[PDB]
Design a protein around this ligand. Structure first.
Ligand SMILES: [Mg+2]
Lengths: 1340, 86, 505
């Protein structure tokens, strides 16, 4: 089973592994994100609903009144996407929000409802996304790039000892929210904890704990443990826990029950601990010196004296032991610690901590945050409260909360969006545990720690940013008392929100003009991931490790397609099957393996979940029922791959192209190319220029149709039917009855885009690929776009190429091209340029666009019409007038000479001066389109009226096409009713249809039916009249222009560029070159039959680059062309259909257990002949990226076409006729023309315009500037010793103002001598240094 | 508006070895080259500039050149002499 | 704030949150006067465009488009038009040049007859980045460059652009001719070796024409000289590789400086005798009686320069380039998939290595050894297997069997195209051929550790997904390192120039 579009030309596939999952829609990431932003959410988690619920209600300080949000709604756009692109406006929708203002009385329970008032208010415009994932901003299509940033939550890290020369690590933890202030904890080389807020001055970690209303005893209880020493009247007999003695040595005699378990000088080992546990040794006698270094936990007070024996967190001595013994304190609390684990970090930080209270800590925090101002208790308290514990200044979003909880091994996924004491305590404990030697630090480049943020989130954030400013203004303007008459509309001004939205959508760093070289460029641009932007990284501070390929990229980020240069590793491409979680993390699909049986169940796993399983490769053999053929399979387990048993496998890959991106999946024989050359080829494939005619690759991968269809450059049938009308500019489909809606004319109309300028000044043009009266189905392709051939992507041309040296003309990546390639216009491109003329209003009077310019000859006005604008189809060159305009020159005093001039030569000459629009020098082309924009209230000229009439004609045509069908149906009904009762037979159809209305019948239901039908006819006519009137009103509307602007006129010029030496060509495998020579046809090498080659490529460029894909592609292209030649020869000498279908079946059956199956027995003879006609220039072939064809299959296909197996033939020299001494590889390659044209490169200057300040030549070809002679060139001239060349370069060529003139005069006089002076820039420097108050002067 | 600025600024004192030690990329290339290897106007030519350019390339004498300079100075933008030869 | 904005405390910004530039900003920085306008500047009489190759040019010539040359040499053309009565005023000459009449082209061809131009390619790392050439007016828009100077410019013809400057005064023109001409800059200022040495196609052609074959057409005949050898080859009566005897006359420099000639019969080939006709008098015949690679050609040029001088060396280099291109084209040397012949012992070696790895894994599972020792032993086993495979592939590649004159079988050096390209030195090395036809080998993780399981496949047979993903780590690491290191090599060279700027003999 094949569709109509595919059945016209079937591509032979060499893939062998069945596909269990279709390639998804390639633009889902944009569409889903904007849908989430714009949809209606019953809860308040996504979109505009979440942003509204995050600010409202807005309550005043008094609390007597507040504003409440009810709901929102989006109105329909005024214009369409095409209309917006033509008019140069923004495609958007108006936002309507229901607000409710409520007033509360005073001295009454709760809030008494004094009065309510509900109003729907206007918030502004919101740009809408098109069907292809773009935005039309000021008439131009734009793309917003997704961002890869760091997930919110807490992350633990440690510099690898490089900061300190001792090689000691410094652990740290960082808490980062979605919106708020960062919180950092860190260690020191002295094992002291410290806290930083917003990357500010370092503070002790005890400050925060004391700010949370905690005491020293509570801190010690939370962090350290407790040990109780008991007074038993004899040397402080102790209840000893054996576990405390691990990794320690006894400093005394340990004894119990008369048995000495541990002796002095003997360390406690595992056996000693086991014996103590078994004997349950508790009572242990210890000497006084054993308590010499212990640290007390809490405070003890002597009851008799009433004073304090000791303070918390303090050491003990023998005198203190004596004092506590006589104080009647039988219990002493100490902190159980050691050196290996349980290290003392909190105690030392407490000691270094200056404060010992709660109120002073807040003062110190205020001084840290806001120094240089007197402190206040209330100010510090409010600052600390709003820093982390306020839901208005600090949000830890749902993903942030989930990551925070998962990092600490909680049980709950959801929680509050603000921090608490427990969170901070847990973070401190986890960091201390990491320091003690248990636990691991986080990997920040792991894709489970990085998140994807798309356009919906960014739009929501900017909308909330505007909304908070609106809320602040409302709260400022609500404290006043005017509640009796105030309305919600008056209270809000919709300017800040609209300004913020426009700024984000037009001038953000991630909002860019869409790359529009070809469909692949747009697909690649819309699937781009960036680590840069607001909240990301910078290419100077990025680092080196973030730019590397990570094991978690597998299936999510393409490891190949990345820019080379400063941004390498920072811009990435999504893989083919990659998705995002609900939290924004990338996931990939896998098949599930159950008891050694590979199933068809698909599970999407993220990077965190992936590492727990054992996942098999897709290069794994399977049986008919789904069993692994072997017993040991290669699998990835925890970031590494190895062999595993058959029953130890959990998941399997779904495809062999799961790891590459869309651009990399279009390179055939990619597995034989080196990775660097593959990167270069993927980069160069998306800057090819469309040519006059499209040509399918003839060696592909099977991804061309998906790219062609999903990009939106083609016309795709919305419903099935029959082609009712076809033309070079429009298609009309007569819809099938079962796909039609009740009460409608079932026709679809497609207006094609013809010769339209793109963002890169190239041509966009659609051509039909259907015939009159043929059936179509939903999803079929009706018209090809640029670089598309019958619904397949076609970026270049098929060229006959030989690999050999040719007299030095392909030296060092040069390309030799035949003249037949030029004569056939195979690489000719169309380029379209726009020019604008603006007529403004001045104080002396308005500028006029007129054809009557007083100071030009009649010849220069021959190309202008009666409105002063050039004709359509005129051939213009540099200096010609496009739009004629004049400007008032003021009110000159009427001197006698001026009066004489006015009398003799007329008054128009003396009143205006010419300011026309002219073609720039060096520009030529044909005028193909003129557009006029007029402000409201200004009179329209003839040309604008003509354009509006042309616009109205098409709308009238479409409406008439629908109305004809509807009225024909109605009149058929009328005739059918008239048949039953008084049928006139021939007398009925002799008259026209409208004469059937003026008839009368019997008093039965026939008259009622006739009246009903006449009423329906009149209603239909009235409805279509209303439609036409609305269309005319929309067409003839005025244009909104900039202030002081009267009219704008835009002219479009089209030119054709042919191939020439200096142009850049490329293949798909990273082989790029520049054309060096165009060779006449009889100088090219040729074979036994006299057929020459098109291109000659150097074989020396293959071996060092290790891109072997091009040689295999050449061999397979030769085989495909041979099959096509067989078919063409069979067609030329008319043969039976049976022979053709037999040979084509033989061609399609070739291979080694390929998955594709084509049966021509189900094809009719007409379909067979059409397919054969489409195959007569070569049979197209598909080879997937890692499931392609082998050499044996290529040799078999060569044998089928009666071609040499080695792929090499004998060639003869064109110039001499002598045979080359060795066989040469000759075949077909797919070549591309890149957008680096030598027309846009060549530039020269002799003299010109200079800068005003520096008096030096300008820069750039557009300014006719000069070339820069930098410091390194000066060094080269110094090394040569050429003093006069350097001096002349420095003075008389750049900024010696008198020297320039003298040198020019002397050169014209034939005297090659200069008189150098002082450069002007040195004088500028002297003046600038003097302006600083420093006296610098030239001496003597 | 005024905002705080406290970021460190790189200078020449950073030794050559330290430049290669750092993993990061420099903010501005020390080498006088771009990443691939304030606005002021421009001078415009008026009628008098064109006339003086033609005077410079004409075989005059010093006295004749001074006379021509005075004459061109005495020419308005409509192309007429605004003073008598006296 | 006026004197120095941002130095003290806060910085006053504009509407778009951009700090305002003060006088100090105008003076200092990379955008200040010193770096931007005083140590370097933009100049008149300059142009730029894309460069292609001209194989017909001489070493001192360049190919300049005439549409560029018309703009570059405009005042010279004005003076020349006024000098011969074609234009009576400056405006007449201006209008004639604007209309592009047929006589202005003759004038332009007259004014550039002996007038050097300077070609420059960025970045200029040493002084050979700017050189002087005599222009030849061509049709088109690209600049044609001599193939022998590209190495000095580090240029290739895949999109590079060059800038052209015109010297104005007599002193500048004489400096361009006497100091910066390409025919004076033959030796390298860094080490003294020649820098106009041939490469690639020239090397391949000269290597191909100077090889010998065991049983070639017209073998064993006696020739009267090189001209008879050329006649035989061009008539199809003898092979370029046939081993013959030729009468050769060679000159040697005397003690007093004269050249003394001696004549003798030499055992050589047809191609060597043909090549002997472009060698200048004064050099021995032993310099061509071998298969010539890159090193041999460099030695030949150096010998010619040391013995004879400068001008003979320039003529010799031009002749060498022409002959190399001609015979490289005549050879028909190509590349095919069957040239990457894979040894038959590869699978046996891989199986043996896998068996050793399996047995050591079993030994580790028995607990006899630790983990690090097992890792090291596995690495050693795989390295030995890779060396065995490389040796087998190279031994199979470099020889072939030919039928002797009497009907025997002999071994000779292979005429395989890839082997010929690598052996001569035209392109490629041993490691790249090993990757093409042996195995990729052991790879490394981004941290630097070696992955235990190597890539046992080569590029002819193709990799799978896992192996390609593994190779991407090293590919990207190398690319990023290359993109980074240039910015600090620039630091190094700037500091070196700054410390030794003023030292003069
Ligand atoms: Mg290049």
């Amino acid at each position: 089973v094949y569709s109509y579009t595919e059945k016209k030309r079937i591509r032979k596939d060499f893939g062998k592994r069945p596909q269990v999952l279709d390639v998804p829609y390639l633009l889902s990431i944009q569409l889903d994100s904007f849908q989430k932003f714009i949809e209606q959410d019953p809860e308040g988690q996504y979109g505009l609903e979440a942003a509204f619920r995050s600010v409202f209600p807005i309550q005043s300080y008094s609390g007597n009144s507040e504003l409440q949000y009810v709901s929102y709604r989006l109105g329909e756009p005024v214009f369409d996407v095409q209309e917006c692109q033509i008019r140069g406006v923004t495609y958007s929708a108006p936002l309507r929000v229901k607000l409710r203002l409520v007033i509360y009385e005073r001295e009454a329970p709760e809030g008494t409802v004094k009065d309510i008032k509900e109003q729907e208010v206007y918030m502004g415009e919101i740009p809408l996304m098109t069907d292809n994932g773009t935005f039309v901003i000021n008439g131009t299509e734009r793309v917003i790039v997704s961002q890869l940033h760091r997930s919110p939550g807490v992350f633990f890290d440690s510099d690898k000892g490089k900061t300190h020369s001792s090689g000691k690590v410094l652990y740290n933890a960082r808490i980062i929210p979605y919106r708020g202030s960062w919180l950092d904890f860190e260690f020191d080389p002295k094992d002291n904890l410290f806290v930083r807020i917003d990357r500010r001055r370092k503070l002790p970690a005890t400050i925060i704990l004391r700010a949370l209303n905690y005491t020293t005893e509570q801190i010690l209880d939370l962090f350290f443990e407790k040990v109780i020493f008991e007074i038993r009247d004899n040397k402080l007999q102790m209840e000893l826990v054996p576990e405390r003695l691990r990794g320690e040595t006894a400093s005394f005699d340990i004894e119990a029950n008369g048995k000495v378990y541990v002796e002095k000088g003997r360390r406690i080992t595992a056996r000693h601990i086991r014996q103590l546990e078994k004997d349950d040794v508790k009572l242990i006698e210890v000497p006084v010196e054993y308590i010499a270094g212990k640290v007390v936990a809490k405070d003890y007070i002597d009851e008799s004296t009433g004073e304090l024996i000791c303070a918390a967190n303090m050491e003990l001595s023998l005198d203190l032991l004596a004092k506590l013994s006589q104080s009647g304190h039988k219990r002493i609390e100490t902190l159980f610690t050691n050196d290996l684990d349980h290290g003392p970090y909190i105690s030392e930080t407490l000691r270094v901590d200056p404060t010992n209270d709660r109120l002073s800590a807040l003062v110190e925090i205020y001084r840290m945050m806001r120094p240089g101002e007197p402190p206040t208790r209330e100010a510090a308290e409010s600052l600390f409260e709003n820093l982390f514990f306020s839901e208005d200044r600090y949000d830890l979003s749902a993903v942030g909360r989930m990551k925070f909880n998962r990092s600490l091994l909680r049980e709950e996924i959801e929680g509050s969006g603000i921090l608490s004491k427990d969170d901070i305590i847990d973070v401190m404990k986890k960091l201390i545990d990491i320091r003690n030697g248990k636990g691991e630090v986080d990997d920040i480049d792991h894709l489970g720690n990085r998140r994807i943020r798309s356009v919906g989130e960014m739009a929501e954030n900017q909308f909330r940013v505007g909304l908070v400013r609106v809320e602040r203004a409302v709260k400022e303007r609500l404290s006043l008392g005017d509640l009796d008459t105030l309305m919600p509309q008056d209270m809000i001004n919709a300017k800040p929100i609209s300004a913020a939205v426009k700024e984000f959508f037009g001038s953000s760093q991630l909002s860019q003009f869409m790359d529009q070289n070809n469909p692949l460029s747009e697909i690649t641009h819309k699937r781009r991931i960036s680590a840069l932007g607001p909240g990301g990284l910078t290419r100077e501070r990025a680092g080196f490790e973030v730019r590397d390929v990570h094991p978690t990229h597998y299936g999510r980020v393409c490891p190949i397609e990345t820019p080379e240069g400063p941004n390498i590793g920072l811009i990435n491409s999504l893989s083919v099957y990659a998705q995002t979680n609900e939290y924004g993390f990338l996931e990939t699909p896998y098949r599930k393996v159950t008891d050694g049986v590979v199933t068809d169940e698909i599970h999407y796993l993220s990077a965190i979940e992936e590492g727990n399983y054992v996942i098999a490769q897709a290069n794994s053999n399977l049986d008919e029922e789904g069993h692994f053929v072997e017993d040991l399979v290669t699998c990835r387990s925890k970031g590494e791959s190895s062999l595993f048993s058959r029953d130890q496998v959990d998941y399997m890959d779904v495809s062999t192209q799961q790891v590459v991106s869309v651009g990399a999946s279009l390179i055939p024989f990619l597995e034989h190319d080196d990775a660097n050359r593959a990167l270069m080829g993927a980069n160069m494939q998306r800057q090819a220029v469309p040519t006059l005619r499209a040509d399918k690759p003839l060696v592909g991968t099977g991804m061309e149709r998906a790219v062609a269809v999903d990009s939106g450059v083609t016309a795709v049938a919305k419903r099935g039917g029959v082609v009712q009308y076809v033309d070079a500019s429009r298609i009309v489909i007569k819809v099938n009855e079962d796909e039609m809606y009740p009460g409608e004319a079932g026709i679809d109309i497609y207006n094609l885009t013809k010769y339209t300028r793109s963002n890169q000044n190239t041509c966009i043009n659609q051509m039909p690929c259907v015939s009159l009266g043929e059936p179509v189905e939903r999803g079929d392709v009706l018209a090809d776009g640029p670089s598309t051939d019958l619904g397949e992507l076609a970026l270049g041309q098929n060229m006959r190429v030989a690999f050999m040296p040719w007299n030095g003309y392909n030296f060092e990546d040069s390309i030799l091209v035949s003249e037949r390639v030029v004569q056939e216009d195979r690489f000719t491109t169309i380029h379209i340029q726009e020019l604008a003329c603006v007529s403004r209003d001045t104080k002396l009077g308005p500028e006029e666009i007129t054809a009557d310019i007083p100071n030009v000859g009649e010849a220069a006005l021959s190309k202008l019409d009666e409105s002063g604008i050039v004709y359509i189809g005129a051939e213009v060159t540099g200096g010609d007038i496009l739009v004629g305009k004049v400007t008032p020159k003021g009110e000159t005093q009427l001197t006698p000479e001026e009066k004489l001039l006015r009398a003799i030569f007329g008054e128009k000459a003396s009143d205006v001066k010419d300011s026309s629009l002219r073609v720039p020098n060096g520009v030529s082309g044909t005028v193909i389109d003129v557009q006029v924009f007029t402000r409201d209230g200004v009179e329209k000229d003839k040309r604008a009226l003509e354009i509006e009439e042309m616009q109205l004609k098409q709308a009238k045509k479409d409406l008439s096409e629908e109305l004809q069908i509807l009225e024909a149906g109605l009149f058929s009904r009328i005739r059918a009713v008239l048949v039953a009762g008084g049928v006139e037979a021939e007398k009925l159809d002799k008259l026209p249809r409208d004469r059937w209305l003026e008839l009368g019948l019997t008093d039965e239901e026939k008259q009622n039916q006739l009246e009903q039908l006449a009423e329906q006819y009149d209603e239909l006519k009235h409805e279509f009249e209303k439609k036409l009137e609305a269309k005319r009103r929309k067409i003839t509307q005025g244009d909104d222009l900039a202030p002081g602007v009267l009219k704008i006129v835009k002219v479009y010029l089209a030119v054709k560029r042919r191939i020439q030496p200096g142009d850049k060509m490329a293949g798909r495998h990273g082989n790029k070159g520049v054309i060096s020579k165009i060779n006449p046809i009889e100088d090219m090498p040729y074979d036994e039959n006299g057929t020459p080659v098109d291109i000659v490529l150097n074989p020396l460029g293959v071996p060092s680059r290790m891109n072997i894909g091009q040689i295999l592609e050449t061999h397979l292209g030769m085989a495909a062309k041979g099959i096509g030649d067989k078919i063409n020869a069979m067609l030329k000498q008319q043969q039976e259909v049976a022979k053709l279908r037999e040979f084509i079946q033989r061609a399609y059956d070739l291979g080694a257990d390929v998955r594709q199956k084509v049966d021509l027995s189900t094809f009719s003879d007409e379909e067979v002949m059409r397919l054969a006609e489409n195959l007569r220039k070569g049979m197209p072939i598909a080879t997937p990226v890692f499931d392609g064809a082998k050499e044996a299959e290529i040799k078999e296909l060569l044998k089928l076409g009666d071609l040499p197996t080695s792929g090499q033939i004998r060639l003869y020299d064109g110039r001499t006729g002598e045979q080359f001494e060795r066989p040469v590889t000759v075949g077909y390659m797919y070549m591309l023309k890149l957008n680096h044209l030598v027309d846009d490169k060549m530039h020269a200057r002799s003299t010109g315009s200079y800068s005003l300040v520096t008096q030096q030549p300008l820069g750039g070809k557009a300014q006719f500037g000069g070339q820069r002679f930098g410091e390194m060139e000066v060094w080269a001239l110094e090394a040569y010793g050429a003093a006069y060349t350097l001096q002349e370069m420095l003075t008389v060529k750049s900024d010696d103002v008198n020297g320039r003139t003298k040198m020019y005069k002397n050169i014209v006089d034939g005297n090659h001598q200069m008189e150098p002076g002082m450069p002007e820039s040195f004088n500028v420097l002297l003046k600038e240094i003097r302006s600083l108050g420093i006296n610098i002067e030239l001496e003597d | 508006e005024e905002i705080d600025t406290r970021e460190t600024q790189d200078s020449e004192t950073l030794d050559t070895a330290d430049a290669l030690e750092q993993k990061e990329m420099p903010e501005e290339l020390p080498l006088d080259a771009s990443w691939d290897t304030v606005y002021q106007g421009e001078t415009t030519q008026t009628l008098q500039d064109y006339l003086m350019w033609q005077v410079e390339l004409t075989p005059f004498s010093d006295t004749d050149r001074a006379i021509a300079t005075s004459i061109v100075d005495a020419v308005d933008e409509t192309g007429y002499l605004t003073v008598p030869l006296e | 704030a006026l004197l120095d904005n941002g130095r003290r405390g806060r910085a006053i910004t504009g509407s778009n949150k951009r700090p305002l530039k003060s006088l100090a900003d105008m003076i200092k920085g990379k955008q200040g006067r010193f770096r931007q306008n005083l140590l370097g500047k933009r100049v008149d009489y300059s142009g730029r465009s894309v460069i292609t190759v001209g194989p017909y040019l001489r070493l001192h010539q360049c190919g300049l488009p005439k549409k560029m040359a018309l703009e570059l040499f405009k005042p010279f053309i004005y003076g020349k038009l006024e000098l011969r009565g074609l234009a009576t005023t400056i405006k007449a000459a201006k209008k004639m040049v604007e209309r592009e009449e047929a006589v202005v082209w003759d004038i332009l061809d007259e004014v550039i007859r002996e007038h050097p131009v300077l070609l420059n390619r960025a970045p200029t790392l040493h002084r050979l980045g700017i050189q002087a050439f005599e222009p030849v007016l061509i049709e088109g828009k690209a600049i044609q460059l001599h193939p022998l100077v590209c190495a000095a410019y580090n240029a290739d013809f895949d999109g590079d652009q060059m800038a052209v400057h015109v010297p104005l005064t007599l002193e500048a023109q004489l400096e361009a001719r006497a100091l910066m001409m390409s025919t004076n800059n033959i030796l390298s200022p860094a080490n003294g070796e020649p820098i106009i040495v041939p490469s690639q196609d020239v090397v391949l052609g000269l290597y191909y024409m100077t090889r010998d074959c065991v049983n070639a057409k017209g073998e064993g005949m006696v020739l009267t000289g090189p001209k008879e050898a050329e006649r035989l080859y061009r008539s199809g009566l003898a092979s370029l590789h046939a081993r013959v005897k030729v009468r050769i006359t060679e000159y040697e420099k005397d003690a007093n400086g004269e050249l003394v000639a001696k004549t003798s019969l030499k055992d050589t080939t047809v191609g060597r005798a043909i090549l002997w006709m472009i060698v200048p008098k004064g050099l021995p015949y032993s310099i061509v009686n071998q298969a010539l690679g890159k090193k041999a050609i460099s030695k030949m040029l150096n010998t010619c320069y040391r013995i004879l001088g400068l001008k003979p060396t320039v003529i010799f280099a031009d002749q060498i380039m022409y002959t190399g291109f001609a015979y490289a084209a005549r050879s028909g040397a190509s590349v095919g998939i069957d040239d990457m012949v894979i040894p038959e012992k590869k699978h046996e070696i891989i199986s043996e290595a896998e068996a050793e790895v399996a047995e050591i894994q079993e030994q580790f599972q028995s607990g006899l050894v630790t983990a690090g020792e097992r890792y090291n032993k596995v690495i050693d086993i795989w390295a030995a297997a890779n060396d065995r495979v490389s040796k087998a592939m190279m031994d199979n590649l470099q020889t072939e069997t030919v039928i002797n004159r009497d009907g025997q079988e002999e071994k000779q050096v292979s005429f395989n195209s890839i082997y010929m390209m690598a052996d001569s030195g035209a392109r490629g090395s041993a490691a790249q051929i090993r990757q093409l036809a042996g195995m990729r080998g052991l790879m490394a993780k981004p941290d630097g550790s070696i992955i235990e399981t190597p890539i046992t496949a080569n590029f002819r047979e193709g990799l799978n997904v896992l192996q390609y993903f593994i190779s991407t780590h090293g590919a990207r690491k190398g690319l990023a390192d290359t993109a980074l290191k240039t910015a600090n090599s620039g630091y190094l060279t700037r500091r070196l120039v700054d410390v030794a700027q003023d030292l003069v003999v």
